[PDB]
Amino acid sequence: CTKRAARRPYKPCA
Amino acid sequence: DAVEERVINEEYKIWKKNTPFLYDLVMTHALEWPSLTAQWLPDVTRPEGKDFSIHRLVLGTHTSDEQNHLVIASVQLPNDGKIEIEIKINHEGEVNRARYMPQNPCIIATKTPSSDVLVFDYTKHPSKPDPSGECNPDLRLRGHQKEGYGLSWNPNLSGHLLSASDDHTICLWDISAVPKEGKVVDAKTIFTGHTAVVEDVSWHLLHESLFGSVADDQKLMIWDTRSNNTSKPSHSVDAHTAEVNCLSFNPYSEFILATGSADKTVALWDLRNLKLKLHSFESHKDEIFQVQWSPHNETILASSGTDRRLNVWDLSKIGEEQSPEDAEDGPPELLFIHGGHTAKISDFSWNPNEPWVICSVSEDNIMQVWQMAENIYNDED
Ligand SMILES: *Cc1ccc(C*)cc1
């Protein structure tokens, strides 16, 4: 989930 | 239009919530004036201890209302901070791009919106303008003036300096033979190949004779100083479908370079066959103004520009298998979108002494010094 959150940083991570 | 700034204001707030998962370091500093230029000085002064090291950065101001300035900032980075202004020096005219000479980093060349290149030596000046004797006029009447920002020193020949000239040319100066206290250096060579405004120029990092240039005529041109014909380059590409604004040579592969442009693509190029674009990186939403390679990693490049995003690309993930839910967020080569900037990123430089640390500057006076989290680049979780 951190590699995925690097590609969408304007959406909140979950 | 007014509701578009609120989309930028809310997506900044999700980023600030996203910050301790995505970064190992975020520093944010409002400068007194915005900078078009950002380059890290190559020296690090760590003392033993302090829990930090001191690193230095080259900035400039671009205002017509006040006395302009050439800025050295000291940035303290930890080893598990503070950003202050070390030197301010009165520059005449706006600072479009500021680069140090590698063979002595006290010598800094600046590109102005007029047709010249200024050269400062920061040791030969007062550290602050405690005089505050401006040379700045009350009006400035520029007629026919469009120029690009590109300015690059030869790392293999001391003094050979290129810049993007005013009427679609590239000028070469050799400042190694400085004349006997006249302090005006005329151009050695004038390169007359492009048909529109030259935006960025760069010497090759290995061969002392080669340089590359990009312009608004959609062309990447590759030159050689030993050629007798300075009107035609050695190679010419129809590179992009719009204005090409930046180029950067790879420091680990001498044939490989990358051009970023106004078609929102970063292209990838081999030097031995320029008729094939190797790869087109696509995730920017607007016009790209800077591309730089990682000096600590061959496989890694970053790009920035008008869309407030600094993308960071990875060549070793090209052609990877991907889900539909991953392909929504971009290509598999896209490692990182920065997203701290709320205005257009004008310039960025990678730190040569701490790996993955980037300083990036935008037009709302924000300088950001940042570094993405260690789990995201090491493929580890
Ligand atoms: C792994 C992980 C990354 C980011 C968030 C918000 C939660 C979990």
Numbering used by the authors:
A (entry chain P): 2 to 15
B (entry chain A): 10 to 89, 113 to 413
What does the paper say about this structure?
Although cyclization significantly improved the IC50 values, the newly formed amide potentially is positioned above a hydrophobic patch on RbAp48 formed by Phe 30 and Leu 31. Therefore, a range of peptides was synthesized which were cyclized using the same amino acid positions but via a cysteine alkylation strategy. In this method the residues used for cyclization are replaced with cysteine and benzylic dibromides act as crosslinkers on the unprotected peptides. For xylene linker peptides derived from 4 an increase of potency was observed to 18.7 nM and 15.1 nM for 7 and 8 respectively. The improvements in IC50 proved the advantage of introducing a hydrophobic linker for this macrocycle design. Encouraged by these results we investigated the molecular details of the interaction between these peptides and RbAp48 by X‐ray analysis of cocrystals. The cocrystal structure of peptide 8 with RbAp48 revealed that the xylene linker was in close proximity to Phe 30 on RbAp48 similar to the hydrophobic cluster of the original R2 peptide. The crystal structure confirmed our hypothesis of the advantage of a hydrophobic linker over an amide linker and indicated a possible π‐stacking interaction. We tried to take advantage of the potential π‐stacking by preparing a variety of substituted linkers which would modulate the interaction by either having electron withdrawing or electron donating effects on xylene linker (compounds 28–32). Surprisingly, all modifications led to a 1.5–2.5 fold reduction in potency, potentially indicating that the interaction is driven by van der Waals forces rather than π‐π interactions and bulkier substitutions are not tolerated. Under the same conditions monocyclic peptide 8 did not yield a binding curve indicating it has a lower affinity than both 2 and 33 which further confirms that bicyclization is advantageous.
RbAp48 (Retinoblastoma‐binding protein 48, also known as RBBP4 or NURF55) is a WD40 repeat containing histone binding protein which is found as a component of a variety of histone modifying complexes including Hat1, NuRD, PRC2, and CAF‐1. WD40 proteins typically act as scaffolds for assembly of larger complexes and RbAp48 has two characterized binding sites for protein complex formation. In order to develop tool compounds for the study of RbAp48 function, we have developed peptide inhibitors targeting the protein–protein interaction interface between RbAp48 and the scaffold protein MTA1. Here we report the design, synthesis and evaluation of macrocyclic peptides derived from MTA1 as potent inhibitors of the RbAp48‐MTA1 interaction.
